[PDB]
Assembly symmetry: D2
Homo-oligomer: 385 residues x 4
């Protein structure tokens, strides 16, 4: 279960570089040099890294400081052949963004947010990012009066439309991926799920330019089925990127290493991604627990990729197993793929077998055989076949 | 706080009619005659009633039995002047639907589900329904292998497309409203939130024919902000109908009377509906707790309407209060309503005041004054102003 | 992973015998004869069965009907050598119990609840039950005014004290196990967690007679760590019995087969039970999903026991692995077992190494190595060592 | 609704003093001088303030630095007549506590934690604290192997026993209050609910010295009914102190001002505290949202107290209302207060009216009238009576 760069595993600078500050705790680790992160992740078999602007270039950097940070980073990338498939803006950390970036009540803040984003889009393109992620962590409210959500959605559309106009004007190929999260740090965050983000995108001027960057933990913070959400994103053609981590149901965003939290959900996710032929980065947005030293950081990072590869093997064996294939037939997964009424409305209306002469009781009596199928899945996950 | 018909309060037959069977409990109340329900609801100042097919006509009724049930119901409606603004299909109760209606793995069940729906659409239109609701309560899974969600969404789209074709073919004015729910009775339900439903609708052949019927409790079962969800639905022009009730956060679907559960959320919902000039039914999908006799049923129903009317008064008083108008200005709600960059992309890019010359620290230092605003809101809700 | 009776796997009649009625659904399976359940479970390698009074003897049975039901049951038990280690009362299904048994507001209902319980205690003793379970599913409220909880706890203590007096008076060896659940079917249930039940027991007249019967799904309905709860129960000497099943975090009580839901929690539970040398029944309180026919029922039941046995093997291999043993030392699990201050208060106060001369920074710099340990645990669970 | 000192409203230094650092955000406010906090809180009509050691004296202060901080604080207290009814230790912020204080795997950390606590107990007593709170925020785990919970509870008991020995040895009157929290910042925290804490206390050497300090938000993070929890604490005689704030169900710890979050729960809490004649501090552990400037801080703090006083008025009016007294009788709350079987076990056994001759159907038919009662409660809360 050794990762190779062809596996397209990527990590945010901010993941292995998390110093372990939480709402009740000071840092437990010194800052990481992005250069060290690039080299160490390469050694572990990573494909690439990602960054917020402010991960790579300290906020408030001079142009000359900015140049030096980027130069050193590119030297590390060039030396190792590591890629930068995705980049994003920090519109959450600085107190200016305390009521949001794109949907800050203060108009001057909204304009600044856009300029900050646009600057980093340029850098992303220079570094070869195919996807530009937007997580609106500060977009929302703790109280009802604070935020008119219709107005906020107007501002959010305006922002994303302007970003679309910008990339088009520049002839960039980069696409946008909106990252939903239901809450935290805001009491409620706008576009709280994959669903809300997908719906919003349809109302943008150039919807083709926007998809989703769903995160395992985020959907699970709403107690939602992450594989189901990813399925709908795939169905919409909108899975531009994905964030992989672990979460123990409905609490604060834990950002455990992938495979931790809901193990079975991780299995069904990997099954879906591989079955669907998702070709995007397998990106880990995770935090090595602050209990850990740097040995633990790199162990946790390695664990992300290991767990993906184990689950990939087990999902593949599941699908390849003739006993499972028969179980799928027994459960009529194959019938689910048949059109309901390719014969058309009139044919359906005129079909006595579909109502008048439908034996509801015979149909009802048919077991779905789902439990046998699921225990085959369990056996395969646990290598108990 | 006396309800009158022009308040547009409506109830499902299945609400006041709930006999109090739960997963651990037998009925605590005898079945209600729909005729009595109509009469009692009329006396309480209800505008209308709604029904599943199987609430009005017992499943498997003969034509003569069906005619007699509909005859008696129509007489009650005519006697009282009660309206039927909405109806729906029961695609969840009968064992045949144990793996779904429209997305049953069994093709013959999918076809039956459609025929059952179409039959009731005709009756709904006869009785004057402007909205036809679909709650796909059995669409989903308890286990990962049981349901291919991409295939399921293909079948779901086919079903809704066919229903659209049908209403078009008949020259009906009735529109569909998809009712999301995250879980229960399936382990996970497809289209689990307002977001997922809105997204799905955009992929239908005739999206204009479909909106959402969000339920307070359902969004809150995912820990989501219901007012925020309703805001997004309104933003999308897709709030065709709404289900009002109470829920205490993330647990089984409680269907408490409206005002119970999250009282603050109820306030902000009514504020939004009234502000936005929602003109649809105020429909209660609730269950009088099984502790109650019939006196308690009618008390609970009266409570739904009473609570709406109190909250309406308090929300209106909030928005009218000069002190609140000043607080909203202090919190820059007015700035939120102004376009971020009506001067356009190029002007934004060239605006040094938006970046190089933006005083981030001065902006960050401005308090949002949200707490003062919210306490004004609290004072108004509690009548302590 | 073949179960043997020595494994002490037990099932409620109501588990495999669940006909699949849920709050939105009619039965999907015919009723099971307890006699068939005994014989089929025996064939699958079960140790025993359990029952509510009303599972074995239909409510309202004549004495002669009661005698015939029990006679047939005992013939099946005697034929197979199947045991009845636990029994319980149904104080939830009948509408009389709509506001509770022991803490019904109606005093006459409370007295009836006790008499119903006492009758079944006698039967339990006849059948050789070592544990008598009480799940107060109807003890609680949907509204604040309905239930004075101090009064309710007075009534609950009175009831349990009377039950203690009864078993003592009869010289029975049977002990009581209180089963917590946070909600459902009541909006909130009294003694909602293992903690609340443990605390309550300490205030009973004869606390030695009472322990807990924790259920996986129930604790997880409060988003709690079930293994942690079981640890505290073990610490208190109060794990008389346990209910094993699966649950996907915070929603309605799913009662999935054991191993389903939170797989990693199941692993850590089995690790703890085996490590602690828990000698009580491994009891499954689960429901074969209503999607299933009887083939699926028995497959689901078999899966309960299979999953326990796989997890038992993996937990044992984890603990036996010298690499894991070293990881545990690296993480100072062994230091956790050392008394903090066996040298006593004065010694601690006078110990400069404990404050004045404690190098906080050196201590802080020590990594806990928890991530390496946890990935060893993951490898072992998945058989990827 | 003007607060005055005799209302016993108290605030942590860390509440109004919160600089607004969260897991995704830098400070939005400058540090507050405790002297200013004391003065401002006094002007708002606060009774008292509380502190962690490290709120009052910066970690690692010299004796001269410590004396100067305490000197200035004492002067503020003396100037204003503000009391210090409670204090506590910070065993969570410093990296040394990253795996806990009392249940750190590292023995030397456990000993340090105790010495740090004991130092502050002395200061607490000097300043007139009647209660010493312990929130073990770092006691727990993110992973299953990291913490043996039985061993941890052994260490936790040792720690609390030693603290009991200390206060006894010094002849202090101060009592301990353990503050439960289910999670955050640990993945799971030991003693996660009021229940678990109550249970644990019963196993201490001197249980009379220990109660609970429950927090609204903490119980609600497990989706529990806070009033119910407080009722059980009162029942046990263990409500030594209470933390008041707001929380929106199952998510990160929000620490909204009291009255925000679950408003209904706030009502029923105040009703209970006042009815039970709780005489302890009404302490607010809250954070003014980081959106706010200092004007917003003091508004938020004022809101805490205002909301308590409104709810107090409404609860008193509810209980005083003859209509409510009648509704409570109709719902048999008076019957709940009567012993079930003061006639004793034998009399109960011999009472045919309790079984053979009990009319179950007549009992079942009696409505509980809970909905009428609750709507009276709603009317009173909203001032609509
Ligand atoms: Mn996250
Ligand atoms: Mn992410
Ligand atoms: Mn509902
Ligand atoms: Mn509904
Ligand atoms: Mn259960
Ligand atoms: Mn159970
Ligand atoms: Mn808190
Ligand atoms: Mn607190």
């Amino acid at each position: 279960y050794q990762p190779t760069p062809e596996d397209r595993f990527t990590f945010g600078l901010w993941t292995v570089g998390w110093q372990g500050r939480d709402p009740f705790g000071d840092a437990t680790r010194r800052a990481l040099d992005p250069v060290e992160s690039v080299r160490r992740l390469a050694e572990l078999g990573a494909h690439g890294v990602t960054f917020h602007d402010d991960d790579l270039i300290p906020f408030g950097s001079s142009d000359s400081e900015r140049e030096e940070h980027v130069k050193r980073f590119r030297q590390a990338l060039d030396d190792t052949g590591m890629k930068v498939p995705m980049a994003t803006t920090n519109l959450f950390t600085h107190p200016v963004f305390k009521d949001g970036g794109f949907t800050a009540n203060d108009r001057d803040v909204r304009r600044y947010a856009l300029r900050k984003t646009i600057r980093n889009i340029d850098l992303a393109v220079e570094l070869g990012a195919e996807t530009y992620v937007a997580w609106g962590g500060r977009e929302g409210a703790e109280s009802g009066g604070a935020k008119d959500v219709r107005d906020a959605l107007d501002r959010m559309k305006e922002a994303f439309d302007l970003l679309g106009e910008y990339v088009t004007s520049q002839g960039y190929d980069i696409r946008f991926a909106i990252e939903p999260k239901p809450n935290e740090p805001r009491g409620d965050i706008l576009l709280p799920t994959v669903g809300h983000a997908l719906a919003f995108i349809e109302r943008l001027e150039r919807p083709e330019l926007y998809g989703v960057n769903p995160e395992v933990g985020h959907e699970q913070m709403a107690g939602l089925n992450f594989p189901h959400g990813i399925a709908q994103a795939l169905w919409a053609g909108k899975l531009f990127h994905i964030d992989l981590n672990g979460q123990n149901g409905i609490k604060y965003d834990q950002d455990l290493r992938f495979g931790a939290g809901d193990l079975r959900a991780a299995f069904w996710l990997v099954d879906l991604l591989e079955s669907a032929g998702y070709s995007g980065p397998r990106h880990f947005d995770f935090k090595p627990p602050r209990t850990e030293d740097f040995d633990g950081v790199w162990a946790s990072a390695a664990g992300c990729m290991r767990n993906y590869l184990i689950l990939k093997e087990r999902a593949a064996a599941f699908r390849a197993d003739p006993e499972v294939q028969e179980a799928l037939r027994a459960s009529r997964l194959d019938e689910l793929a048949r059109p309901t009424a390719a014969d058309g409305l009139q044919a359906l209306l005129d079909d006595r077998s579909a109502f008048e002469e439908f034996d509801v009781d015979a149909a009802a009596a048919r077991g779905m055989a789902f439990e046998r199928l699921d225990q085959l899945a369990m056996d395969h996950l646990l290598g108990a076949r």
